[PDB]
From a paper:
We defined a canonical motif, involving a phosphorylation at position 4 and a positively charged side chain at position 1 (R/K), accounting for ˜ 50% of the [name]-A2 phosphopeptide repertoire. For phosphopeptides with this canonical motif (hereafter referred to as canonical phosphopeptides), the phosphate moiety could act as a “phosphate surface anchor”, mediating extensive contacts to [name]-A2. To address this, we determined [name]-A2 complex structures of three canonical phosphopeptide antigens (RQApSlSISV, termed PKD2 and derived from Protein Kinase D2; RQApSIELPSMAV, termed RQA_V and derived from Lymphocyte Specific Protein 1 (LSP-1); RQIpSQDVKL, termed RQI and derived from adenosine monophosphate deaminase 2 (AMPD2)) in both phosphorylated and non-phosphorylated states.
To test this, we solved the structure of RQA_Vnp in complex with [name]-A2 ([name]-A2-RQA_Vnp). We failed to crystallize the [name]-A2-RQA_Vnp complex using conventional approaches, even in conditions used to crystallise a wide range of [name]-A2 complexes. To circumvent these problems, we co-crystallized the unmodified complex in the presence of [name] ([name], [name]), a broadly expressed inhibitory receptor that recognises class I [name] with low affinity and which we have previously co-crystallised in complex with [name]-A2. Crucially, the [name] binding site on [name]-A2 involves the α3 and β2m domains but does not involve the α1-α2 peptide-binding platform, and peptides crystallised in [name]-A2 are identical in conformation in the presence or absence of [name]. Crystallisation trials of [name]-A2-RQA_Vnp with [name] yielded [name]-[name]-A2-RQA_Vnp complex crystals, allowing the structure to be solved to 2.7Å (right). Comparison of unmodified and modified structures showed the RQA_V epitope undergoes a dramatic change in conformation upon phosphorylation, greater than for PKD2, reflected in the higher peptide rmsd value (RQA_Vnp versus RQA_Vp) of 2.1Å. In RQA_Vnp, S4 adopts a low conformation in the binding groove forming no interactions with surrounding residues (right), but as for PKD2, phosphorylation results in a raising of the main chain at this position, permitting extensive phosphate-mediated contacts to [name]-A2 (left). Although RQA_Vnp lacks any S4-mediated [name] contacts, the low main chain position allows additional side chain interactions and intra-peptide contacts, which help stabilise the complex. Comparison of RQA_Vp and RQA_Vnp structures also explains their equivalent affinities for [name]-A2. In contrast, for RQA_V, while the conformational change results in new stabilising contacts to [name]-A2, this was at the expense of multiple contacts only present in the unmodified form, and hence the net affinity was unchanged.
Author numbering:
A (entry chain B): 1 to 99
B (entry chain D): 4 to 55, 57 to 137, 140 to 198
C (entry chain A): 1 to 276
D (entry chain C): 1 to 12
The structure:
Amino acid sequence: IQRTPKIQVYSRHPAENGKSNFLNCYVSGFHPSDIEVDLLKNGERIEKVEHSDLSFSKDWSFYLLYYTEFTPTEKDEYACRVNHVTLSQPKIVKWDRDM
Amino acid sequence: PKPTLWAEPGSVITQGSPVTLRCQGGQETQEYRLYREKKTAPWITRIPQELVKGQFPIPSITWEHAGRYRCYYGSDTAGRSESSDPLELVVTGAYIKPTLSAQPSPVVNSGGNVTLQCDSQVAFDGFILCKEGEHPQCLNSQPHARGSSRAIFSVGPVSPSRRWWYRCYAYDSNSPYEWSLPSDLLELLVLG
Amino acid sequence: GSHSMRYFFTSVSRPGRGEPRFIAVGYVDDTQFVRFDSDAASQRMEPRAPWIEQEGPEYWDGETRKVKAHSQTHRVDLGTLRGYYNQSEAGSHTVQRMYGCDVGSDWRFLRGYHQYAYDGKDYIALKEDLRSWTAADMAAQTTKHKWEAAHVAEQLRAYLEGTCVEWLRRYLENGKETLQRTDAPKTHMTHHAVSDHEATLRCWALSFYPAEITLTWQRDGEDQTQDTELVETRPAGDGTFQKWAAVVVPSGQEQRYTCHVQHEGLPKPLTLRWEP
Amino acid sequence: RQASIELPSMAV
């Protein structure tokens, strides 16, 4: 049995175009664990992204937080780019201030 | 009045491919307003007003584009046209393909029935069987058992005179407009 | 209130790429404190919380010795099960385990558990009394028979009802400022138009702890359970959680709906309207 | 702190 990941892109504080924040890409309920997650600022990858340590829910599916510091802007377009054996090709979910 | 909502080539498109949503008010008005139910389609407002002809093109469709749409003209303080009948736009190829098979076999005597089995390796609870060879006639269904991720269909009675070619897709019921890659084609062989 | 300590181990095989990847991590409720990664350049059981930075090399040598042990057991299981289910030499597989104890309200021990999983599915679990096992499938019964005979159910009840709780209460104190404190949810609403006739009302709850929460949408009182979108409760990344609920409403009817917010760090349940 | 899980008795 395999499970396709859920993705949420968001922030650790309410967005505001002046302030800086934490950009979050939480991926959960996936099996197997082998997953590649990137955070993109306008198309291109962001060298030096953190995350938290693989762990799992009552049903043994996995979840991970890939976060980094960032400044929301009028122009800039942020996104998460995920890829997992269950997907035919990487998936790009853009950040949306309000989900 | 009222308008009509349709897609070209069709309303069920593989990802990475082109499509256009078409609207018309019988009465060639350019007050065409397109929207997606439940969540906003940012792509719509990146279309040039010249086109908003009742023409909405998609260079190459992705999951972003998937959903239920409606078309309408007027304003409320100006027009007031009833809104279009819903167009469910479906993107395929989001995930890896399921596997299709005929049980107990793909060869069937004339006028008989056969059981089709759709097996996804990815836990999913939506399965669609479409008969290829005209636009497909697709049928919906759920798994047989509880933790199955396997759907069963029943076709027939079959005839040597026509082609009986199928494919299936799997999907999450939480986003019913996002289907997987289709299984390879399955051909029934009707012993004439 | 009531507390838990929990350990989560995951080991995965890499064919041709030599040694398998291993990870492990411990929690005291919804806060991570320890972490091991077999790939991690450190090759040690690193700290994750501030209140654990507090332990002499005596700890960082035991919990690091011990995880390499666990890693080594899992190194073998991966091969056993490959045979128990006769799978090819090729292909990746996963085994996972989770254990901990629940200290009840009064800070004495309430429940223990130890569960095992192969390739995502249940494999074996230590039942309630911590002196019997439950096998998910036929293959698993061999492991049970092995284990009840080699005395694992009994040597485990000693770690759980004993030194596990003990060290938990110990972790509580060393970190009361957090694990015993709270953050109630900062709640707000947003409006988003879908058309000239419909909008979405999204009910937010942010920066809270513990994760457990409930968001309900009503319509004049009548629960709108059915036409409500909910997002998985997600992590803010400072030890707090977020979440939202959302209903599509007819334009003009916004004042008809209310969002209820039940939580532990809230003396009264809440009620929010778009236009008061 | 962690626990047992050292081998060989812990093997499945």
